[PDB]
């Protein structure tokens, strides 16, 4: 869906002109940051390609991405878009993780509550129109 009015989050990606990026090598849809679009490619590494959305090394589809600063940002902040920061291990190609469990980073466990060395694993982009071009929203659609 190239024209829906509301896109998903990158950790909860969906499945069913002015294209800043059209790189060819189902239709997944999400929203990420500007300078993270480079990570939607085979053999990449980061937070997005580790904990949020991974692509295999032998891929056949395409990748489309385009700016969205006039729709997905507002004066004050748009805290409705999220991404996963912590995970126990990297993903697998096309896997998906919608869990919201506390991440334990030490040796004593969490009681399911935050505190010393226990972090809530999801973090939001607070999108604004007066951001740099690398910190502005970007809508991404991946084919096949």
């Amino acid at each position: 869906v190239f024209n829906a009015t509301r896109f998903a989050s990158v950790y909860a990606w969906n499945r069913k002109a002015s294209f800043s990026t059209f790189k060819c090598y189902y239709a997944d849809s999400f929203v990420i940051r500007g300078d993270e679009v480079r990570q939607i490619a085979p053999g990449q590494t980061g937070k997005i390609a580790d904990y949020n959305y991974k692509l295999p090394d032998d891929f056949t589809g395409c990748v489309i991405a385009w700016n969205s600063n006039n729709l997905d940002s507002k004066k004050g902040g748009n805290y409705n878009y999220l991404y996963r920061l912590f995970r126990k291990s990297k993903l697998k190609p096309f896997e998906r993780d919608t869990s919201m469990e506390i991440y334990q980073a030490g040796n004593t466990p969490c009681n399911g509550v935050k505190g010393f060395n226990c972090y809530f694993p999801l973090q939001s982009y607070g999108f604004r129109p007066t951001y740099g071009v690398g910190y502005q929203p970007y809508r991404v659609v991946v084919l096949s």
């Binding site: 920061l85 060395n117 972090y119 007066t130 740099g132 071009v133």
Partner: protein, 586 residues
């Protein structure tokens, strides 16, 4: 799981939260500055309080990772940056007392008046413009006897509280705390302690002394012409006659001490107000200059969200470069059509280029290598942009202009008055403060020693005797507003080290005072290799990348002023060079 991995995880959480909180705080502050109202002074305080509370909590819970269990030296730098206590080590009564003392000392300064003139612009126009001995002496002694006499005992208590605050942080006094900005540990070959900065400063001043002797004697002869029955040809210079309230710069003396007065200096104000230049042409020219040496353009937000003209609503028109984070760079400056705003633009855009360089380092590693790098990087651009070759290459000077050997001495002498005439002042003031923090000057001798180190290091004498109810040093903005003062010395040396290295990479033949680094990419790769590091490396390594050595040096500063030194040596052939600490005007 080792205590290092947990530190890395804690830090990559901290960075992500602090970026957002800091952006919204600084946006509030900008919105206030560009449009002063009543609703905005509150929206500033809201976000300021939020950011400060966040920082306090994160430092408190960062103190639980002991540094001895960390082998990576970047994690160590950031954890050190976060594990610092501050006035949190004192009590609650002592913290509140220190804040009350600081606020009282600031407001006594900023609203002081004598009889009905305030310091700005009342008593500053009598010090920069008047030509009367008696009126200048009146303004000087009035400012000394109204404000400082009120700041003596507050300062006496300030010293005690600051010393014990710093001793509870495992330093030895507050001067040591201050010198702790130039310390490096753990690196093999690039180490530096807090007791070696004193040695370096005192080792370089011994070589700056002769040029200052000759300039002091020249200025003394000219002032002896202007104030005939008041100056002695072998003594010091009276303190109230240097075109300044304190004597920090000797600039306003130019009109009295110009070498060849029948040759006017360069001023392209008419050549630009006559071609219809405006406020945007200046910044387009500065952008062209910085692109010529291979640095990037400006961003679109810079052109959309910068205030580059006075909009008739109030505002604070002080020139400033803003780095809000998240790709947001701005400038606040109400510029005119003049030859000094043309240079301030280059200064501020040098600040912005340095900011844009290290925007990839983690949140806490985004500054200069130490406290004297931003200003040097800004100043070398104004050095290289004011060159008659540059002003002729942009069409702002006629090709029928020919440089004159008598006009290159007026320029060098003005530069000397501004730049060299301020170094003994800085060295002496910070030496007095260090010795008072250390405990080597008792209370009952403070003013006895101030006016003993003015007659020896600076060569300046006081017109009337000052007993021990006075606090003359605290009558300066930096001393009663709790700021350090040694960054100016080190910055003034670094700027000439930088400029010599860059103009040597640009294959310049001739005197150093004529060099222009425009159209040189090899001079723009050497600067960027230091700008990109932020403060992720010891300042000695970042200094060695550009220069070739790893410490301060005074030889390029003396290479800049060599023709002036030869001229002055010939001018003072039948004079006395050096002063005697015995003659006093009373």
């Amino acid at each position: 799981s080792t205590i290092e991995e947990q530190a890395k995880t804690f830090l990559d959480k901290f960075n992500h939260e602090a970026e957002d909180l800091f952006y919204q705080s600084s946006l509030a502050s900008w919105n206030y500055n560009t449009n002063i109202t009543e609703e905005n002074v509150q929206n500033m305080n809201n976000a300021g309080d939020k950011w400060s509370a966040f920082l306090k909590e994160q430092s408190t819970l960062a103190q639980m990772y002991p540094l001895q269990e960390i082998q990576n030296l970047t994690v160590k730098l950031q954890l050190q940056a976060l594990q610092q206590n501050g006035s949190s080590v004192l009590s609650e009564d002592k913290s509140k007392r220190l804040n009350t003392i600081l606020n009282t000392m600031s407001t006594i300064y900023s609203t002081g008046k004598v009889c009905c003139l305030l310091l700005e612009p009342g008593l500053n126009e009598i010090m920069a413009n008047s030509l009367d001995y008696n009126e200048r002496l009146w303004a000087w002694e009035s400012w000394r006897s109204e404000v400082g006499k009120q700041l003596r005992p507050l300062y006496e208590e300030y010293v005690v509280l600051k010393n014990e605050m710093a001793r509870a942080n495992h330093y030895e006094d507050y001067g040591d705390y201050w010198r702790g900005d130039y310390e490096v540990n753990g690196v093999d070959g690039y180490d530096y302690s807090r007791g070696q900065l004193i040695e370096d400063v005192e080792h370089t001043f011994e070589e700056i002394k002769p040029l200052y002797e000759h300039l002091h004697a020249y200025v003394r002869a000219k002032l002896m012409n202007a104030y005939p029955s008041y100056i002695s040809p072998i003594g010091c210079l009276p303190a109230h006659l240097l075109g300044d309230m304190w004597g920090r710069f000797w600039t306003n003396l130019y009109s009295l001490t110009v070498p060849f007065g029948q040759k006017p200096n360069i001023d392209v104000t008419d050549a630009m107000v006559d071609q219809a230049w405006d406020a945007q042409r200046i910044f387009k020219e500065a952008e062209k200059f910085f692109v010529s040496v291979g640095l990037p353009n400006m961003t679109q937000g810079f052109w959309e969200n910068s205030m580059l003209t006075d909009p008739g609503q109030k505002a604070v028109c002080h020139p400033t470069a803003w780095d809000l984070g998240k790709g947001d760079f701005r400038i606040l400056m109400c510029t005119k059509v003049t030859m000094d705003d043309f240079l301030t633009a280059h200064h501020e855009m040098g600040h912005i280029q340095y900011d844009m360089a290290y925007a990839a380092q983690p949140f806490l590693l985004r500054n200069g290598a130490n406290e004297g790098f931003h200003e040097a990087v800004g100043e070398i651009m104004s050095l290289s942009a004011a060159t008659p070759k540059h002003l002729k290459s942009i069409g702002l000077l006629s090709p029928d202009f020919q440089e004159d050997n008598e006009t290159e001495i007026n320029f060098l002498l003005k530069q000397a008055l501004t730049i060299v005439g301020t170094l003994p002042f800085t060295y002496m003031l910070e030496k007095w403060r260090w010795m008072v923090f250390k405990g080597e000057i008792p209370k009952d001798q403070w003013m006895k020693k101030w006016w003993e180190m003015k007659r020896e290091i600076v060569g300046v004498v006081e017109p009337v005797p000052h007993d021990e109810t006075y606090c003359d040093p605290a009558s300066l903005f930096h001393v009663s507003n709790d700021y350090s003062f040694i960054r100016y010395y080190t910055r003034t040396l670094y700027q000439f080290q930088f400029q010599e290295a860059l103009c040597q990479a640009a294959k310049h033949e001739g005197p150093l005072h004529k060099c222009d680094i425009s159209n040189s990419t090899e001079a723009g790769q050497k600067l960027f290799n230091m700008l990109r590091l932020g403060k992720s490396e010891p300042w000695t390594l970042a200094l060695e990348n550009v220069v070739g050595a790893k410490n301060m040096n005074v030889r390029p500063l003396l290479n800049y002023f060599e023709p002036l030194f030869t001229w002055l040596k010939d001018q003072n052939k039948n004079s006395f060079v050096g002063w005697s600490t015995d003659w006093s005007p009373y």
